[model samples]
Target chain A: GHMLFISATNTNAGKTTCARLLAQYCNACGVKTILLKPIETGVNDAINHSSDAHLFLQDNRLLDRSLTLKDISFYRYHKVSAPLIAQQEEDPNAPIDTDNLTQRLHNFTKTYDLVIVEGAGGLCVPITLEENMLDFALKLKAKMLLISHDNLGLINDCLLNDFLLKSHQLDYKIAINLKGNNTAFHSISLPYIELFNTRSNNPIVIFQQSLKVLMSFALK
Target chain B: GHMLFISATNTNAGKTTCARLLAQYCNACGVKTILLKPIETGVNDAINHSSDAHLFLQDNRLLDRSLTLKDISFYRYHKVSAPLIAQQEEDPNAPIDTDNLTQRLHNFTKTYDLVIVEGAGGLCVPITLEENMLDFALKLKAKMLLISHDNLGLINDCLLNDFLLKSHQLDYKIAINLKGNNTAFHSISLPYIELFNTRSNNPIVIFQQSLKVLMSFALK
Candidate 1:
């Protein structure tokens, strides 16, 4: 596929890590890729750098080797809360340009064979008071790849994200991004009928045949 | 009019406090209300008493002065998290009874003029492996009174709860429960068109016109 957007079930559900792996896998397969974060919150003012952008840069080197902060992310908020609140507190005057942001991704797609977009916060979150991150994904027609991990309320949390995306009628795939130590609590399970792939530190491969299947069809 | 379910946007967002204040306001108004906790987690094993049940029973005296821990709450679990998680940890074999819980509330309504049911955890929280608190409310047909307070993600949190309830086609009203010694940063304004009541500890009223409006239609 030419493009895929990474969205998380909840904050800290491994969106950045999954996106980094996906970009690296695609680039190694000889597909030139660029990973983009339209807007990010919790920008460490101490260094004026984003921890998310830093992670993605190391693997894909998406845009270029010497990537400026803005090249990876268009907007950065200092506070660690919703993007809208952070935007108001960090810079009320400077508003996020939804249309211009979409156009920039359109430009990136032309230069890179594959453009991997990482959504800030969540699937159904407001990057600005008037604009939602989901709207931009729809504008770009990027298929969403949901990044989920184990937590206390995995059942409700994952279902909520699933419902929201289906209600939006978006094309998507689900994956379990299991990472902190070995574990499995069958306390919660997915809709047994639905097919999902998993990625983590295990004997089994991450993305386990799912990513290969997607690209295999693309090669056809 | 005869029953109201107190639910919150998140854990520790003052579900108990709102239920307490609500029962107090209704009792002082001669409504003859009884606060009920169908299921509660985070029980102190050493004390063998739910702090939530303890807080709700103080001064109200709806179910008699000699209050036992089980006098108000029907179910209790230690090692608090989601009720489902706690249930799994506490007793793997025992599953919560959704019908029995609803029936208990129904029986309470027959005796009290107003039966205020307090939910554990958040509104969309699971009370069992198969059912959620929302499901119990639906079965009891209680009008939901959402208790939202200031938290960093209050904007999204409250909206999610509101959306979930409305989408479920449940009858409900939203309120600000500001009892904690603090607040969260406001990223955006509350939906200006929607009117919500506020409950605070100051000399000002907690339930305020919310009780009056709800009871007016009740007594009318």
Candidate 2:
């Protein structure tokens, strides 16, 4: 199965942005693509606005049926905090069952040709009591793609995440998201990308293009 | 209680080194301080050696009880990777519970007056099944002191961590560690420190001294 697993060090580090960009890149190349946010939280029932998942689906021009929300099973905690805290706030009683969730994830994998599982928060986010999002990626034997911002501390955070993935013996690539309209991408991103490219023997994909072009497909 | 919370963006980002330096500084100022690492993982058991703690005590000429192997808690899992992976390997049957651990941390708070809690990994590292080290600091209601290396991407990592703390209404100060003997600090650290100091209503400390001097205090 042709698959891409996109994750971030933390929330808003541009996982969705990267996912959309990759999907759009594939679509531009005439590849049959589907964008799947296997698990999503942080939507208030009172506010009838579209969720992040909806935004991704709309952005990708994916069919409604292609984006399955119900089958993407997991605990939805109300807190806008991280997954574990959100789950704790939503229902302390129903802690995440990693084994069960892993099984469910495997089931989801059977359907999609190139599944893009965007992790909720950072790479280490707790998906279930026993496993985190990274754990799930490792268990699934997926080729991981890390999305990080071009902001300060990218080196340490990115390196640490890369180290964790390498320690886990996973095949991974990194995508550095230039955070804002600032034209000056950090000089460090390129060298580090090269370093990792050389070290991991994998190409480090960079989104140096305009965020508008990137987000256009993400916000379509 | 005089307590110091030492943290970093990622491991080997000069957290231990900074903690040692801070302990040394506190000793110079005649402040009684102890470096307490609540959780020790991986092979390098610097905490066990009481390297930083011992330096502080020796420098101050104080006969404070040295940190033994027992003084530091070991949530040991043979897996030398991140906590999430380590937990999966060692005790897949019964995972570590962070909430309960946080509750237990209250016990340590009572014991040490100037307790410097050295985090196991980066600020976002998984401590329990559900919580990272940051959550424990919040639970302890301890003041935060972030230690990051002077390098590229330090600004983004530092600011994001700062923003997250502020969003949670937690008080924090950043200490940019000038790693190595290089006299030229990252050009960004100073300017960002000034920006944070000018913009933030709360106090943001920026230590412009060498790692030698920076580590020489009990950061309280």
Candidate 3:
């Protein structure tokens, strides 16, 4: 079973966009692809549903009547920060559990040819009281695809995130998404491209026409 | 009792320097301050001792027989990143107990008029299997003073940290430390200062003369 875990430096750092892009690319390449949002926390008002998996299903149009809402589980908390903080704020009484989620993830991996698990917030954000999202990825033994952008502190955030993954002894690749509608590229992205080229030599695929092609190669 | 918690974005981000400056200033101002290093995880190798309190005593010349080694109780772990990692690595059998540490902190608060607890590594570094440094600080009900330098990504780091703290409903103030040697100040700091100045009126203290002046005001 092959699984790909995609995470970001922070929320709205293009986790969903990258996930959709990768899933689409893989699906187009004739690979059986399934998107999983393991746990969704800190959404209480606008979106009553707590699971990111549900959101992904909605986004990817993968919702099916055969799968009950309970089958697609999400851990919800009130705080818009990390999961632990959200859990602490929303329901201090709720039992913190990531094992159940892990079991579900294992089942998903067994069923799908390619499982794309998207993480909430940053790599270090705690999914449970005891385990972080990165820890969950490690436990599942999934290859990581970190999604970061060419923001102001993209270099530091991306480097730190990459360093952290290496520190945990995880084999992962980084994808730098070029943010902003303005096609005028910033000079900061150049330094990151150079840094990744020199340091990791891991494929640094810039967002554009190249990302789709890169995903096809990665899937193969 | 007046208390200030000193934390940083990353290691070598001037947490120790800031703590020393604050301690020196408070001591000079007759604040009857006591400097405390709570939960030192990565320094046992460097100190060649079982406890971090002994090392602290040796460094500060505060080694008195009355102050037992137990006064500096630490939850030792091997991981250099955060307390959670260290605790998990050091003793996989028994998890680091954050509740016990929280209780221990309560006792320390009663002993000192103005307690300055210096955090290890960054503000978000995990302190236990279940909690990070920020959560521990919040549990202690201590007002935070985040120390950062005049580096390029300083502003982004500071802003993100501040946002997390606010999101958690934690009361804190960001202290931007202009490192003496560096010529270029962070571009984002000035803009944030201007923005927050209108709402909270929190002063962004620039450290030039000494950290003592900054500490005196922070505590007062």
Candidate 4:
């Protein structure tokens, strides 16, 4: 399948930004891409544009010019939490609709050259208590593109994320989100990225160099 | 092997503290325990008691004064970094010797009922440029005990850690460090832990209640 699952090592690790950028990049290049967020919390039902889903579409100017935010996000919640936690479910059938969404992605593949489904948070996030984001992403058979961030614990967090992906026998790559100009970060993160790239035999590049690498991976 | 591999979701998530506590608890209760750190980075040669290795030995009072720190830790690096990055090589056979350490862990199982091997930083810290801590932990076949901290991203971090251990087909548990007031953390962390426990079918308990539980898991 010509699909990529954009995930992160942690919360605010910039998955949405990466997804939006990748979708914009691929779509403009005539991939006829659609970025679907299977589920997103921290949304305000009161405001039309109060969610990551809306801002994602609004910033990228994706789909129809008049396309409502709900068109892209299959599920939205106001809890500002993981879907299993506070999924402010308005629909009585939220739990039963995940498979239909999975099948829809299959149908999307026939329509678009590339389909990007962004996960709610990191892997292992509960879409439901029984079904997690990892299993869902696996079920979709998407090429994994992780949004890795630089911080005090990046090495550890990214390790666990990568291990989980590898253990699940998934094909994946990393796009590092270098947050700031901390000296310690430059020293640590640079070595880490190099080591991880060599170890995984996968592209783990900084954001500046990541776009082309990401596109190339998808094109492959 | 009867061993508990203490790892974390992030740095300072309390791997050493947990290892120390678990080692102490089990030993006191007639478990005949020994704690080993296969690899440790960020050493200061100036003081004999300058590193986690030394502190671990000092607090536990491992052996007689004649006993060297090297007896406890198979490898030590001067750089306070991952073994894969700043791994200071004092020995000629640095990269080629992980197996000896691996062999040592098994030998330790012969002498002790439960051997607690503390991991450096997070799961991804490289033991060698080619082999990460996660791979090493898997090679050792240790029961996973993750040191998860309470924070905005606890659920996400814990999930990734859990996923790797589960994917590895290893039995595991979580020790969530409070590091906050009850009311402040209860609303979010408590609920997250409950659902994670149910989802993982793995024991996820607070660090405060961990010592006995860790010992229990190890004893069984």
Report the C-alpha displacement of residue B194, candidate 1, in angstroms.
9.5
The prediction achieving the highest TM-score against the true structure is 4
- Candidate 4, residue B83: Cα displacement in angstroms equals 0.3
Listed for every candidate in order, the interface RMSD values in angstroms are: 4.9, 12.4, 11.8, 2.0
Q: What is the lDDT of residue B216 in candidate 4?
A: 77
lDDT of 1 by residue, B105-183 (tens): 7777666898888887765566754567788888888887877655444544455555577678666776666543553
Question: What TM-score goes with each of the models?
Answer: 0.75, 0.50, 0.51, 0.82
Candidates ranked by DockQ, best first? 4, 1, 2, 3
Q: Candidate 2: misplaced stretches above 4 Å?
A: A59-61, A64-68, A108-111, A186-188, A195-200, A208-220, B1-7, B10-25, B28-220
Clashing pairs in 4: A42-A80, B42-B79, B42-B80
Superposed Cα deviation of residue B50, candidate 3 (Å) = 48
Rank ordering of all candidates by TM-score, starting from the highest: 4, 1, 3, 2
> What DockQ does predicted model 3 obtain?
0.03
Who wins the lDDT comparison? Answer: 4
Q: Write the per-residue lDDT of candidate 3 for residues B18-66, one digit (tens) a residue.
A: 6666666666666655666767764555556634355455434442346
Interface RMSD of 4: 2.0
* Pairwise lDDT winner, candidates 1 and 2: 1
lDDT of 1 by residue, A49-149 (tens): 44787676665454477765577678877777667656766788988887887787778777788778888766556665555667767777777777666
lDDT of 3 by residue, A69-175 (tens): 44544575554545655565567787557677778877876656777878776676555545667788898888888877755445445655655666676668777
Separate clash counts for every candidate: 1, 16, 0, 3
Write candidate 4's Cα lDDT for A1-220 as tens digits. 6988888887757777778777788777777777777688767757666466766667545555765566667777766566766652445355635687788767768767888888877787777766778788888888888888767667776667666777776778867787656567767557766656665665467765677678778768
